[PDB]
Each structure stands twice: as structure tokens, then as C-alpha cells.
Amino acid sequence: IKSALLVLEDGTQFHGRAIGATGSAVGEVVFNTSMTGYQEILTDPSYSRQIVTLTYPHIGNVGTNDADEESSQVHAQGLVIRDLPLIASNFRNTEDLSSYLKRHNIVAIADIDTRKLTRLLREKGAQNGCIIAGDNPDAALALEKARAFPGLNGMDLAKEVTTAEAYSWTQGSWTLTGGLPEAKKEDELPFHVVAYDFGAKRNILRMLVDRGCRLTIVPAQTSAEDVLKMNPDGIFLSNGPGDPAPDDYAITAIQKFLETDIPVFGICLGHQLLALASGAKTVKMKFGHHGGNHPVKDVEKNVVMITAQNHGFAVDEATLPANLRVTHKSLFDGTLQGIHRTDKPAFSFQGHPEASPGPHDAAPLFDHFIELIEQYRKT
Amino acid sequence: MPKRTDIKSILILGAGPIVIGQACEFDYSGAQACKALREEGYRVILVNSNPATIMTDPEMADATYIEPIHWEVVRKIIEKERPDAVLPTMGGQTALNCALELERQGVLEEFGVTMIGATADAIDKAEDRRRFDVAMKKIGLETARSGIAHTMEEALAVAADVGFPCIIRPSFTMGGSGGGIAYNREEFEEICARGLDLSPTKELLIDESLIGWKEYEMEVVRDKNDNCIIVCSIENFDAMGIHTGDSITVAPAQTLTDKEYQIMRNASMAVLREIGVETGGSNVQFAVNPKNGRLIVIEMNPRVSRSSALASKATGFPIAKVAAKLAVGYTLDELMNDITGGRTPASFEPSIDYVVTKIPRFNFEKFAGANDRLTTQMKSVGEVMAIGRTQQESLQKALRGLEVGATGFDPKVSLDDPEALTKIRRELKDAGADRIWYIADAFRAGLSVDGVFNLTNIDRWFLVQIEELVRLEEKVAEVGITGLNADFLRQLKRKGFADARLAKLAGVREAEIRKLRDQYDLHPVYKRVDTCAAEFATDTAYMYSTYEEECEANPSTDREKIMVLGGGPNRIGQGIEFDYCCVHASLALREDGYETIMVNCNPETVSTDYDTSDRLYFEPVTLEDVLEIVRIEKPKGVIVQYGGQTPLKLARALEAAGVPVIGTSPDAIDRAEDRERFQHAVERLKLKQPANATVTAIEMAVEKAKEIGYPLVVRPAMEIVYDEADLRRYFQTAVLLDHFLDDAVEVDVDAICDGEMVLIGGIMEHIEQAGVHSGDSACSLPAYTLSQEIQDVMRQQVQKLAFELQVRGLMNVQFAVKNNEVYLIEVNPRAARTVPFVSKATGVPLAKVAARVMAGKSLAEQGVTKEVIPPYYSVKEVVLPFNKFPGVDPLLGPEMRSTGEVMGVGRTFAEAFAKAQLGSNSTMKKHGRALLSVREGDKERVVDLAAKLLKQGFELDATHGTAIVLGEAGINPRLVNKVHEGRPHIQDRIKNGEYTYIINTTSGRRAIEDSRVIRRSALQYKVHYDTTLNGGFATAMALNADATEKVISVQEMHAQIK
Ligand SMILES: Nc1ncnc2c1ncn2[C@@H]1O[C@H](COP(=O)(O)OP(=O)(O)O)[C@@H](O)[C@H]1O
Ligand SMILES: Nc1ncnc2c1ncn2[C@@H]1O[C@H](COP(=O)(O)OP(=O)(O)O)[C@@H](O)[C@H]1O
Ligand SMILES: O=c1ccn([C@@H]2O[C@H](COP(=O)(O)O)[C@@H](O)[C@H]2O)c(=O)[nH]1
Ligand SMILES: CC[N+](CC)(CC)CC
Ligand SMILES: NCCC[C@H](N)C(=O)O
Ligand SMILES: [Cl-]
Ligand SMILES: [Cl-]
Ligand SMILES: [Cl-]
Ligand SMILES: [Cl-]
Ligand SMILES: [Cl-]
Ligand SMILES: [K+]
Ligand SMILES: [K+]
Ligand SMILES: [K+]
Ligand SMILES: [K+]
Ligand SMILES: [K+]
Ligand SMILES: [Mn+2]
Ligand SMILES: [Mn+2]
Ligand SMILES: [Mn+2]
């Protein structure tokens, strides 16, 4: 008997079993509906400071593997699941989920009514929580920790995850046959994209490389000036945790790129940035969008795409400046999903065109980007 | 875009009678389709020869045709209804086959009928195996190494190339019909010859083996805007080499990494795009090498199917309703998701927070000479589904809901049997219907998960789970009931262990475990299905039980509730007919204002469609499970009389537990079911019954047998013994004893009793004599040969019986007519399988009326007090699964073996019968050469039959004795040799196409075993044969009619009723 317990701000207690590290974890608790991809999810920086609950009962069926890591580490504060399978059963597996959580030092609990939890969050919105795994978990403690929590709401998360020094990426996408390929040689990629690391998913880079870009990764706080100096074919705004304050540095820099004619493309956080920097307003969502079955309509072609979502904040459509045109909306809630600058060669998408995990439907967003890029170089 | 405007009227091709591989799922689907199109204001016309379908309910559509599903008949329908469009993807293979034939015959052209949902070319692209293989290669998807063959020589050559074992798959077939696994050349020629002949396009695809790879399916839907979604993914528990339909499968997939899932998802889509499915759904099948993720495409089915129905139940996403809507120009984005209160759209992929398990249901015990190993051709007769929060939970619930008497992993071999491991071994290596239990036994006997794997190829992810349960069972067994503390029990309930299985292990009564649970306050909670893993709320009450914290049942305090218990999986004798009744009870009562709650777990049925009732508990129909529902629902009444044996069997115990059973009492029920109790009442009523005896000993029997008089009906598997010598014989191989009523007419009578009056629903006279099960007999309503005076006698005995037995709602009574004398065969105090047929025939919805009765509204109050005798004849005929089990002697007898039935409507009996015969898929011809080989007692009446055939223009052949009799009457048939007599013999002649008709009657076990070859050959070579003289006559009469001459709708039929 290895106990574990999870307590919500509201005081709602979930008693189950520990399947990860011994100790505690406090964080905003969220629910993800993805039936496959738990590893990629756990390794997504966007999850920093968050307590992740998966709706799919059996988590860990296929073990873990390095190729399935979206970042250099686990970003999730904790993991909440219903059942941890007896074994991992998949040719690609290199280490069972429990061992992996241990290795990464993640506090994780299993055997709790995730459905109850899910419904609570949907109904009453996101809540801070605390998990405690050990010999005799103390609920009041847990409760206490939960309550004490500052929360995300008014936190600069991206700074926490961003890279300390800038670097170069030239590695493309995994293939069943070849796996993760050898990094390409600079001279092999036509373009040169500068990517702002606000806590970037590796699949985003890989799939950019795939399209012929040679990247240069940069810290969140990097100055437009310093950037411009590099002579970028494209400027990319990565995904990441939390939301930017209209206050912060990237806004300012983003604004400056928008004075120029360079092509700008952001994903998720990147999208919010672009929107703020354009005079738009972001909002925190009741519970947000986290899952991989999200219908998104391209209002421009009236077509639907099934996508990978992970966001708690969103761009208020009603407060959109006239230079921002709506390109996509959620079919689930009608929230704003895509935008394009009428005046500039800038656009963004709330969802994760890079999936990983998730359906490949939105991959083409990348393409527009290359187009842009190519036409910029034409001039 | 919105709905199509250039279309007003639509013809929907139904699936026809239920058969192995093509079952109720099509009633579910056809109904959804009818519902969906009528909702969208279209004029619906449909064709379905199967009368036990909710889809043929008059009020469901505009113009309903219960006529043989033959292109020439549909032609008359088209000609008469002038449908603008034709939807051929909701009727199984029958529908695809018919659409294309219609196409081929120029009929669609002739009346300007536009094919919707799927095009003729799309269908062929998918259905023609060569064409499918070519499309895959075009899209870069990999297929097994294979070869097309149109002949045996061609076939042999491909085999030469792919080696054994090899898989054979016919073009234009499904459910594995006509295919198999060839381990050798001998096996090879047999299946090949069988499939070439079965293939509509006389073509096979022969593949190299992938036996043992993982098997997967994906349910896809596509709209005209090119929007595409995966409705559900399915992972087969049983590997490649055992047909999906005969396999245990779960949703969603379990062992694929996201990467692998996306690749499979992409291919899926690619497959629909390439074949050309633009407005509807399809099932795409794959094989995956567990060793390397290597993906292979197997097939695609351009229509709704058994998996689509399972997928729809599994997720709450109504695939067919949606697809029907897509076929008429709507797009996914334009439609709303049903269960999420319409709040969200149909354009999204479902996400589920539970595990779904499907287990097929078999009936091998009814086919003893049959090969009972599982292969690529389906052999299951039904399936059950279960939902649990975990796979263990899900798995065990399905087991206890399977209706085969298991309570979960009940043991098959003894721990102390020295030969146990060898048996287990064999059962593992060569899967049969019992494999699942044998896996558990394996673990009890000491084999390791890897050993099991090696023999089974079942993924270890599943295996480990079964192993853990066995381990738990062992502890239960060690600690006994005393160690069944609350923590432990709870654990056990969470893994899905049944009170019954626990009881067994602890050596106590089930009620003891149950009581234990009550003490501890250990009850399940109910979760709801919502398609989105709780991401959105739902206003629908589609629930399953589980042992968790939060309950979502939220029962009403508001209304008076009525509970309808389903029949669980379908099996021979427990078909869709009972389901139909169930559905009607719920529809009528609901309409009447009650709150209807359905309890069933058959994924194929209308009963488990959330739209049929107010509340749906998708649960095993067992005492444990029902009690839990009653516990929280506190219904006003419960109906146990409409779901067949399953619920009937729980009646007393439910009552014992305090359940408010309505309608005929559990005790009443037993009075009729118990022989003894029944024999006393007959007596009391002064009715006639066949002499009988209850023998203990052999020698006892022989004596008593003398008493009763031969022939004799030995009901312990039933047999007809003819002489003393016969008696022992049986005994060896081998207790009620009844005098067999030889040369008697069998009759069925359906009726309703309200305590005040009796309503005769219908008097059905069987074509086949008593001794051929009623469930396998053709029948007529009205009687075609029985006197009005004799019928009047039966009506009276029925009334006397009804009142005496205290019937309340439906009842069924079986009689035998011998020498102008009425004898009682049996009383079934509940809804019988003929009910739906009687309803259709007479236009009175007996199941609705009787449910009203059961609920409190008398016959007089409803206005249904007089027996209807329609102005036309109605004939029901059956369909037999012999073709799926070639080693079985395709002969009729006292045990029921058919899977489905059809109905034929005519101005005369001859016409009705001809329609029914045709609709049954008979290969009868109006010309040719007939073979006559009859038993002694038939020798007399065969002359007349021989003359009638002669009058029709047939030529005749006959075996020795038959020829002798014919000769004396002035008829000289050509003589034929019996196999043992020389050449040529029958077998040669039949195999050479010399006959278009066979009448072969046989009496007596040995003579039966002896004549085996005729019937077997007849079937193998598609020649129509009759095994009863009565049937022979009926066939003769039909020769005078033309089934394609006139068609009539159900609405029309009903309208002629006064
Ligand atoms: N190459 C193969 N090796 C082994 N088993 C196979 C192979 N191809 C198909 N099967 C098995 O045969 C079954 C029937 O094949 P399928 O193409 O789906 O035919 P049907 O259209 O009659 O359902 C599959 O579900 C699978 O188990
Ligand atoms: N004494 C009998 N004489 C003639 N036929 C009989 C007799 N008893 C039963 N049968 C035949 O056996 C079939 C099955 O018998 P029944 O008692 O009705 O069994 P079940 O419970 O399967 O309905 C009947 O439909 C009928 O053809
Ligand atoms: O090889 C055979 C062929 C037929 N019969 C049976 O014998 C009868 C017809 O033979 P006969 O009376 O015309 O000679 C039928 O009941 C048929 O089933 C046999 O026993 N053996
Ligand atoms: C599977 C149903 N059939 C093929 C379409 C065979 C009985 C109808 C004739
Ligand atoms: N009504 C049962 C089917 C009859 C079949 N032709 C036979 O005579 O055996
Ligand atoms: Cl046809
Ligand atoms: Cl078929
Ligand atoms: Cl391989
Ligand atoms: Cl214990
Ligand atoms: Cl067989
Ligand atoms: K728990
Ligand atoms: K191939
Ligand atoms: K299988
Ligand atoms: K097919
Ligand atoms: K009969
Ligand atoms: Mn098929
Ligand atoms: Mn198939
Ligand atoms: Mn009977």
C-alpha cells in the first residue's frame, strides 16, 4: 500500500494510489481528453506548473520512448489517471510509465474517479490542486497547499521554460522506418527561421525543418533588434505556458517585426502574442481546450479540421483590431482559433498544427508560412 | 450544403432475413435511416422481407414493402413508387448486391433512380477485391502478397505462389462467407470451390498468411465538403486469422502509440477518398505486425456494418442517422451531436473515458457435426457488449452478460486432471468458442503469459489482465467468505467480479455476497455515455454501471416508471423477434406517458438505441445487475415477458427480491413451463395431451414406452425414437417420454389475456408437420388447410387456458391436429417469436397492446377486442444456417436451427408461399428435372406430387422403392442409383446439375444417416430441396404463382383490413 491523494482548492478529495515520485505537487489542475499520446503530452512545456489529468482510463499501455518526448523534460507538475496498466505492450517501448515518472521525479496518482474530477472542472472551471503521495498523506496539508497556491493567473511562465542561450536546430520529423533522422547540414535548408522559445514543442521545429527551414532558437526575452540583425527569412513565435502580459518584452519586440515586412507565424502562445501585439485582448478560459479531437473550422474555405488543443487563454474576438481578420473558429465553442494581419504577412493559430500528439489535419498551416517566406525572399 | 432539393422520394434497400454474418445490426441501421430521412421530410420507401424489424413498421415509413429482396421484385417496386433516389448502404451485403444488380439490369436507368450515400462504382471499387488491391497500391498503402482467381486452376497457381497456409477471400461477400484458411491443398480446393460458387462475381483473392498479427478496425465518416472523421477505433482481442465478427474486440484501440495511431488514421481516410465514399461512413480494416508496427490494409466495407453498430453504441455517435443525412447533401458541420443535447456538431471525433468490450455468441451445440474451430468465415450467431471503467471491469461484465451461464471466468477443466494441460494447450492453439475460459484455466494450471501468448497470439496487454484476475480468484478461494472484507470486496467489484462468481469461490450463495455488499454499502454508481469524455454535458440517459465515486443516474421522483428487460445477445431461437417486442413495449408505454427504462446489452439492436426509451442501462441482464437498477430506480413495474428466456428466467428471483414484476406472474409462468405443473392443469381443464412418462432407468423406459406407444419424443437435445430397438440405441448415445403425434398438423396461436377477456392474435398453421420445430417451420396466417370447426376448438382451449393460467398480456399455445383431434403441445405464457409476424399480418401491434394490458389498461379500454382475419394470406418462411456448417446434415427435425425468417403476402396461399419461398433465397426453378426419394409412409402421397410436377413440365428421377410405387400408379420416372448401388448415382447427378428440384423424405435415425449425402450434395450444389412432403406440396402450389407479378405495401395491406 503506497498511498496518494489529490485535493482541490474546493476541498474535494480524491484517494488513490501513488505511481510516481514520493512527495507533493501543487498546480492548476486540467483535464486532457487524448486517448493516445500521454508521453508527448507530459513532455509539453505548456504544461509547466500544471496538474494533468487524463480522461482515458488506461494510461501507459505503450510505455515510453525517447522519440515520444516533445521537450527535454517532463513539464507537468503532476499526473492524474484512472488506471496504470500491469504492463506496457508495444515494440517501441523503452521504459514503463511508472519508472519513467520516477526517473523524472513526478508525483503521480492512479485509481481515482477521473470522470468525477473531469465533470467538476468542466462544470465549475479550473482549480488549483495538490497531490500528495507517501506514507500518510495529510489532506489538510494538501488542502492548505492547494489554497496557498498563487496560481498561474498573473505569472510569467514562459521565462521559466525558455532556453538560456540561443541555438540552431536542423532536425526533421520521425518516420516509422527511419525513426528520428540525423540533423541536416545548414547548407541543406533553404530558409532560415528565427524561433522565439516561449517553451517550444520539438515537433514544431522538426516539422519546420521538414519544410526546408534552418532554425535559430532564441530566448523569450530576445530583442527584436538583436533578431533583425540575423536577417531572418521568417520569424516564428512558439507555443508555451501561460499567457503574456500586455506589459512584457516580447510584445514590444513583436511589434517591431510587424513594422517590417518579415513573415511572422505563431502557434498557441505565439498566436496570443501576435494578437496582443496587434491590439487584441486575451481571456482566461473557464477550463480551456486540452485534447486531440477538436473541430476547427477554416471560415475561409468552410472546411473542418480535427485538431490538437492545449490552451487556457484565448483571444477575445469582439475586441479584435480591424487589422486582424478571423481565419478560424472552434466548432466546439466558437472561440477564436486563427488570425491574419490584413496589412501584414502575419498570422497565427491557437491550436497545434504540429500535433504530436494528435491528428495531422492542421499541418498545412505551416505551408502558408513557407509561401509567405518564399514571397518575402522574392522581394 | 443543406438538404438536397432535387430529391423528394427515396428507396431504402433492407437487409432481409437474419443470418450468420448479417444480423440485427441492419434493423438498427435501416430504422435509424428511415427515421433520419423522414425527420428531414423525405418520402420514404423501403424494402425488407424480414417482418421482425422495427424498420418495417408501417408508421416508420411512407411505403413499406415486405417482399422478397429480388431485383425483379424491387423493380416492380421502383416502377410502382418511382423513387427519385436509392440508398443501398444500410442493408448489409444483400443491399449492395441488389443495388448493383439493379444497376446492371438497367433498372435504375429505366426509372431515373439516383444512387446516394455510395455510388455504384465506389461499391465495386471496394467490393471487387482486385480493384481494392489496385487502389491501395495507388495510394501507397501496403497489402498482403496475393493473387486473383476466377477458376480453380488459377487459384491453385496463386496458392503455389503464396504457400500454405493461405487465406481465401471472395469478391462481393462479407462475414467471411465463402472464405477460409487453407492449411493444405485438400482444404484449399474445398473452400475455393465453395467461394467461387458463392461469389456474386465468381472471383477470389488468395493471400499469404498474416495469422497472428494484431487486427484493427476504424469507423470513418465522410461528407461532400471533404470533411472526414474517425468515429471509433477497435482493437481485436483475437488476432488476424479469426474473423472480426467471431472475435472478442474492444474500443478504443489499446496498444498503438500515438504515432502509429495517426498513420492508421491517415490511411483510413486515404482509403475512403480513393474508393470514392463521399457522403457516408465506412469500416476500414488493418493488420499490424506487433514486432515493428508494420501496417497492412485488409479491406474496406462501403456501408454501415456490425462494427458500425458496435461503434455507434460504444461512443454515443449515431453513425447511420448521420450518414443518412449525409447522403442527402447535409455536411457534418451542419448537423448537431445527438447526446450532447445538440449543443455541439456532428463534425468531431469522439473521446471515451471507459472501455468497451464485445464478445461474440456461438451455438455450436446446435450443430454437432460441425467444425467448431474459429476461422475467417464467421460462425457466431450473435454478440454482447459491455462498458466498464477498465478493461477488466469491461471484460467480466461482458462475460456475465453473454447468456451462456458463465459468471465470468468459470473453469472448464479440473485442477486435478492429469490431462488438463494438454487440453488447455489445444484449445489455446486452435481457438474455439470457449477459448476465453481456457485462457483462465491455463493460468490456473501453471502456464505463463508468454506460453499463452505463443499459442494464442493474443497481445500480452490483455493476457496479464486475465492472469491477475485468476490470481485474485485464488485469494478469494483461500480466504473464503470471511476474508471478504469491505476493502477487498470493493477491489474485487472494481475488477468486475460478479457476486455469483465470488460466491462460487467462497462456497456460499450469490445472495450471501449480495447481502454482504448491502452491509458494506457497496453498490455501483452509473456513468453516462456522452461521446466526449465528459468535456460536455449530456441530456441523454444512456448509462452503464461501475464501481466508482460519483453517480450520474439522477433518477426521477416525478413519473411512474416501467422497466423492460432485454434478451441479451441473440442466439438461435432467441432472436430479434423478442427484441422487437421489447422495443414496442417501450414505445407504447412511453407514448402513454410512462417513463420507460430499457435494460439490454445487445449492441446490434434497436433496443439499445438511446432514442427508443427514456432511459437506457446498457448492462448485463442478470439478477445482480437488474437489482441494482431497481434499487435506485424504484420502478412502478417491470416486464420480464418480452425478452425471451433470459429475463424469463430471472422472474422468480426478481420477485423474491421484491421487484415489482408486472403481467403474468413468475409463478404463473412456472405453472406453464413446468411439465408436471403443466400436465396437472391440462388435466384439470380436461384437455387432450400426448401420453407421456418420466423415466429414470433404461429398462423403466422400454416398459413405459410400451405404455405410451411408439413413435416416441425423448426430451431430456431431442430425439424421435420409433421402436424398442430404437429406444436402447438412443439410450446408449444418451427423462420425459411422450407419444410422438405422427402425421399431424402443427399450429401456433398467439393471444392476449387481460383477466376479463381473451384476444386471439393469430392462428398459424405450419406447412411442416409436428416434429419439425415450429421455429423452423414455414407457416400461414390464415390457416390454409385447417377446418373452421377445428380452429374454433383451439380458440376455445386457448381461452380456457388463458384464464386458468392467469395470463396477463401475451401468450402462445402450440397444438397438434391429428385425425380431427386437437392435442396440446405447449403453453408459453409470454411473448413468442411469431408475434411480430402476426402483428404485421393482421395490423395489430400485439406487443403494444399487451404491454398496455400489463400496465393496467384492459383490452376493452384500448378497443382491441375482436380477432382480425386479414383479407390476404400471410406466409412466413425461415432461413437456415446449414451453409455455414457443411458437415452438418441439412435436415429439419424437433430442434430449432434457423436464424431468421421472411414474410410473403399474397391473394392466395400459393402466391404468399411463393413470395416467402423466394424471399428465403430458394433456388427453386419452374422447370427442369426433379428427384424423388421418399420414405415409406410418404410413398402413397408422393404419387400426387409426382403428377403435379409432371403437370408443371418437370421430368422425374427416382430411387428404387420410390420408382416402384410410382410405376404402379402409372408414373415411370427415370431410375437413379443410390450411392451404393452403382453409377450413376444421385451424387453424381446432383453434382452434374441434373436436377433443379429434390424432394427427399426420411424417417429413422439410421435411414437418416444413410441418406446424408443427398441433402449435403443438394445444398452444396444449390439445388432447392424439400425434406417434408408437406413442404413439397407447398412448393408445388407455388409453381402456379409468380412472386414478381404483384407487390403491395404494408400501409396498403393494413388499409384492406376491416
Ligand atoms: N492475409 C491474411 N492472413 C490472415 N488472416 C487474414 C488475412 N487477411 C484477412 N484475414 C482474416 O480474415 C478475416 C476476413 O477478411 P475480410 O477481408 O475482412 O473479409 P470479409 O469481407 O468477409 O469480412 C479478417 O477479419 C482477418 O482476421
Ligand atoms: N408429442 C409431440 N408430437 C409431435 N410433435 C411434437 C411433440 N412434442 C413436441 N413436438 C415437436 O417438437 C417441437 C419442439 O417441442 P416443444 O415442446 O414445443 O419445445 P420448445 O420448448 O423448444 O418449444 C415442436 O415445435 C414440435 O414440432
Ligand atoms: O443412399 C441412400 C439414398 C437414399 N436413402 C433413403 O431411402 C429413401 C428412398 O429410397 P427408396 O425407398 O426409394 O428405395 C429415402 O428416405 C432416402 O432418405 C437411403 O437410405 N440411402
Ligand atoms: C448474406 C445474405 N445473402 C448474400 C447477400 C446470402 C444468404 C443474401 C442472399
Ligand atoms: N420451412 C423449412 C425449410 C424447408 C427446407 N426446404 C426443407 O424442406 O428442409
Ligand atoms: Cl437480385
Ligand atoms: Cl455475403
Ligand atoms: Cl514484417
Ligand atoms: Cl484483503
Ligand atoms: Cl462444418
Ligand atoms: K480510489
Ligand atoms: K500486395
Ligand atoms: K481477429
Ligand atoms: K469489402
Ligand atoms: K411443425
Ligand atoms: Mn468485408
Ligand atoms: Mn471484414
Ligand atoms: Mn415450442
What labels would you give this structure?
2 chains, A: alpha/beta, Glucose Oxidase, domain 1, ten-stranded mixed beta sheet, 17 strands, globular, B: 1058 residues, alpha/beta, Rossmann fold, Dna Ligase, domain 1, 7 domains, 39 helices, binds uridine-5'-monophosphate, binds tetraethylammonium ion, binds L-ornithine, ligase, channeling, pyrimidine biosynthesis, arginine biosynthesis
Bound molecules: adenosine-5'-diphosphate, uridine-5'-monophosphate, tetraethylammonium ion, L-ornithine, chloride ion, potassium ion, manganese (II) ion
The end-to-end distance of chain A, rounded to whole angstroms, is 68 Å
What radius of gyration of chain A results from the CA coordinates? 20 Å
Name the structural class of chain B: alpha/beta
CATH class assignment of the largest domain in chain B = Alpha Beta
List the secondary-structure elements of chain A in sequence, H or E.
EEEHEEHEHEHHEEHEHEHEHEEEEEH
The third-level CATH topology of the largest domain in chain A is Rossmann fold
Summarize the structure.
The structure is cut from a larger assembly and holds chains A (379 residues) and B (1058 residues). By secondary structure, chain A is an alpha/beta fold.
